[PDB]
Design a protein around this ligand. Structure first.
Ligand SMILES: [Fe+3]
Ligand SMILES: [Fe+3]
Ligand SMILES: [Fe+3]
Ligand SMILES: [Fe+3]
Lengths: 439, 439
């Protein structure tokens, strides 16, 4: 019956206290750690209502009649319902229509209409939005017309007079079928990215929980790495596997990249975690890029020195330079600052680090990496992100620091909330004391 | 610095014996187990040439000038190059163009041109194919035109006279820009799915290795589950986490679904792995849906009974029925058989299992789930997959067996190669003896 005997009919996040329920979420392990940490749990019903209201408002503000979503991350934002998320990312079997009057319909996997029933804001569970060759072979086009006619009828009933339908991403068969029904297809991502960019109070609570769980998982990985690196057998993959397992054990969902590398494989950055046998007296740098508990992305980066010797002075300087970079850049953060002014006033990396610097100095984060992208001045494009920061935005602040042809790089990154009058760094994970020149 | 001291300049798959190399792949753990199991390793160079030749021929055969791929799994097929695959699945930053003359170009993440340089069949490494709102904000359109003009010039030089460009999936800004350059956009998935459907000799060797690694990882998971289920603490997530870690430790890449469930959460099927505390004397059913070593998908399902008591008779019957289903259907497999004849002649499940049966009785598999999909008679669509099986195809054979309103389901699934004369079941994982009604 109850999954948590110490509680009544509901868990702390308001969901049912029922070991046999369909809905998943954080494990008892995660909840125990969070309670011991004194973290306030999100109320999921209020969270789901917040997102839905805000997304509906976004449609209305643009004078659109609706938004059609095939990206599982947008579907997750709109409904909080998951279904084979990773398979869904490259197999578009799922769709959500949200109309300007708030009416929301999901076309789900035929076999699994029950996966969104926990959210009453999802008014209908249908099927048949899977318009790709694996699922339908030479008969995609017939179903594309069935599906587009369904969307037409829903829009006639729930957004009469509107011809503009925003779509995040759709297969060409789907696009043509919708256009044949008389829709003008608008850019759906411009709707979803800007909506998702402002977190409500429950999303922020959810993120604090996910962040705590992610930092716990990383601490397990550090413990494992410092204990086993340089034993002649332990690989990058061995270390990284710890993060995978500890995330899953806390109700997390997946990891977006393979960004953990050791020794000379840290420079250039973006070499992937693999079989390399790790060594004593070497750098290990990683980036969590992690979809964690409550489906919230925790995106932080740390660089470790592991060995009996001291790190080289150039490693210490680089680490200190990287730290100075993100602390200076996050100090720019407060409501009302224009994104291009972040670009213009950002901390200046030394010349020898300019060539291999990161693809941005900041980016948004929520269910994954999100709008905005804050480019360095030499890559920034005029008229691309002319908007101010607002309370409720969350930005990761980045530093990649390495020389061309060098044998190491530093990667640091913290996750930062915009508050009413400034910012709050959510990330508490320590910086390697030897690399920081403190030890 | 060799990663394998017992070898010369190359590893057994022909790749460099170099601990510090960029290229990732199977771990020393995986290679060690495969050697002990007596498995011949693929030659990756010949594998990569096989795929590239076959895909180029597919373009030529259709009278197209090129194939443009944004799906990371098609990119993986064409180049064997990974780059944040999971991030890529829902962030289309990457693109590969293959022209009718075999000329092949990748547009990669700006910061990482080196990630595909190990494959000399990739002739150029460019950037700027990232046409989505996160990456470019309100200036996607400008870059979409830059990108489309580059594709035009390449097609002019390497497929002159062709206007037909196959595209698997592209953002609408990209579609509009390509059509503005005079391209007729063809269905790219019809090209990629049919090409990937036939595995060459080295791909089959890679799949044998991946299958062995995955089966090893599942055996670790089974050991964990049988030792810890019913301790009042161990969750579905705890058990599943073992598969995650053991896959990563062997050079695997990710898991596509969350299909592991315990007790009453197995019925209906497609309930996701979650926080449920597992119980003694209960069914656990799961589906690996796993992207494993060498990036090969291993897609198998097993159902376990764990407890001091015997399974109920209806459980044993359902298991035997499920096993009979896949063995009977698998027996249909040999070259020349038309896919809808598989549909027409499949084993018939008992009436009480029909309503909740699986979405297909078979589907292709390679780098992930692939064409064809073999539907049950009541879902099959005429003219959707009118094609014969061929040697080198690999099909998973499925069984979901459960009653409406029931408190358990069985899920069984094996991965089967089509041979010159018939079939070869690649899957050797045991079936639960107690559920099979054996002492
Ligand atoms: Fe990151
Ligand atoms: Fe980041
Ligand atoms: Fe499966
Ligand atoms: Fe399958």
């Amino acid at each position: 019956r109850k999954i948590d005997p110490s509680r009544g009919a509901t868990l702390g996040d308001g969901t049912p206290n029922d070991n046999d329920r369909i809905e998943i979420g954080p494990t008892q392990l995660a909840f125990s750690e969070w309670a011991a940490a004194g973290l306030q749990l999100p109320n999921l019903d209020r969270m789901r209502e917040y997102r839905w209201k805000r997304l509906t408002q976004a449609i209305v503000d643009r004078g659109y009649g609706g938004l059609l979503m095939f990206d599982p991350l947008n579907i997750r934002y709109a409904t909080d319902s998951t279904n084979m998320q990773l398979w869904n990312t490259h197999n578009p079997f799922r769709a959500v229509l949200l109309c300007a009057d708030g009416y929301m319909v999901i076309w789900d996997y035929k076999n699994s209409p029950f996966l969104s029933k926990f959210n009453p804001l999802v008014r209908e569970q249908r099927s048949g939005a899977d318009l790709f060759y694996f699922d339908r072979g030479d008969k995609v086009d017939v179903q594309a017309d069935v599906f587009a006619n369904e969307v037409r009828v829903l829009m006639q009933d729930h957004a009469p007079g509107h011809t503009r339908l925003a779509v995040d991403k759709i297969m060409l068969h789907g696009l043509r079928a919708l256009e044949a029904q008389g829709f003008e297809i608008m850019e759906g991502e411009e709707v979803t990215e800007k909506t998702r960019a402002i977190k409500g109070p429950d999303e922020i609570l959810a993120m604090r929980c996910a962040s705590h769980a992610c930092e716990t998982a990383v601490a397990e990985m550090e413990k494992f790495a410092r204990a086993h690196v340089g034993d002649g057998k332990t690989s990058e993959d061995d270390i990284w596997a710890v993060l995978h397992a500890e995330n899953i054990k806390r109700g997390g969902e997946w990891i977006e990249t393979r960004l953990l590398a050791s020794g000379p494989r840290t420079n250039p950055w973006f070499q992937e975690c693999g079989p390399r046998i790790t060594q004593k007296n070497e750098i290990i740098a990683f980036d969590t890029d992690l979809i964690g508990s409550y489906g919230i992305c925790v995106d932080i980066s740390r660089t470790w020195w592991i060995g009996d010797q001291k790190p080289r002075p150039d490693m210490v300087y680089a680490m200190q330079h990287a730290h100075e970079h993100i602390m200076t850049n996050m100090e720019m953060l407060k409501p009302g600052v224009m994104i291009p002014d972040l670009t213009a006033n950002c901390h200046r990396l030394d010349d020898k680090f300019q060539a291999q610097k990161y693809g941005c100095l900041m980016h948004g984060v929520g269910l994954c990496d999100e709008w905005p992208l804050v480019a360095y001045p030499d890559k920034a494009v005029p008229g691309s992100y002319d908007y101010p920061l607002e309370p409720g935005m969350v930005l990761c602040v980045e530093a990649a620091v390495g020389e061309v042809g060098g044998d190491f790089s530093i990667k640091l990154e913290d996750q930062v909330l915009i508050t009413e009058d400034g910012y709050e760094n959510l990330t508490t994970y320590p910086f390697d004391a030897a690399l920081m020149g403190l030890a």
